Amino acid sequence: SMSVKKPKRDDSKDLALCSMILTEMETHEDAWPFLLPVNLKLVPGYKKVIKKPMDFSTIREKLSSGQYPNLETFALDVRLVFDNCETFNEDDSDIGRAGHNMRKYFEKKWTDTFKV
Ligand SMILES: CC(=O)c1cc(-c2ccccc2S(C)(=O)=O)c2cc(Oc3ccccc3)ccn12
């Protein structure tokens, strides 16, 4: 509260660390469904069903241009990729499996990087 400062984590390396995580994501063999925005002209349903599309190229651009206020906003966009993937794709399909794999990959890096 006013004039009562809470201790806060050192956030100075967050940008570099999130960039590194995103690079690891981008180069994963199963990243292929997530590299570019879902093609709204070619993918019937997508536009209407998925209210907030997100993908790794969009996140990279946002990260490179100061559009994440903090590391949590970054993680929210990463998780949004995988949440959209699950909404739109069967768990059993190649894309749905890829999404599950990439979510797991991401969360382990997230915990290992930012949870002490
Ligand atoms: C993430 C997702 O739901 C998704 C991703 C693609 C896709 C897959 C392969 C290459 C490129 C893309 S993208 C990001 O350019 O859309 C995809 C494709 C979908 O429908 C198809 C599938 C085959 C042919 C045409 C459209 C549906 C969902 N996604």
From Swiss-Prot:
What does the record say about tissue specificity? Expressed at varying levels in several tissues, whereas a smaller transcript was expressed specifically in testis.
- Where does this one sit in the cell? Nucleus
Q: Bromo domain location, by residue?
A: 9-113
The disulfides recorded in the entry are none
Q: Which family does it belong to?
A: Belongs to the WAL family.
Assembly and partners are described as:
Component of the BRF-1 ISWI chromatin remodeling complex, at least composed of SMARCA1 and BAZ2B, which regulates the spacing of histone octamers on the DNA template to facilitate access to DNA. Within the BRF-1 ISWI chromatin remodeling complex interacts with SMARCA1; the interaction is direct. Component of the BRF-5 ISWI chromatin remodeling complex, at least composed of SMARCA5/SNF2H and BAZ2B, which regulates the spacing of histone octamers on the DNA template to facilitate access to DNA.
Function field: Regulatory subunit of the ATP-dependent BRF-1 and BRF-5 ISWI chromatin remodeling complexes, which form ordered nucleosome arrays on chromatin and facilitate access to DNA during DNA-templated processes such as DNA replication, transcription, and repair. Both complexes regulate the spacing of nucleosomes along the chromatin and have the ability to slide mononucleosomes to the center of a DNA template. The BRF-1 ISWI chromatin remodeling complex has a lower ATP hydrolysis rate than the BRF-5 ISWI chromatin remodeling complex.
The protein in question is named Bromodomain adjacent to zinc finger domain protein 2B
Taxonomic lineage is: Eukaryota, Metazoa, Chordata, Craniata, Vertebrata
Underlying gene: BAZ2B
Shown portion of the complete protein runs from 2054 to 2167 of 2168
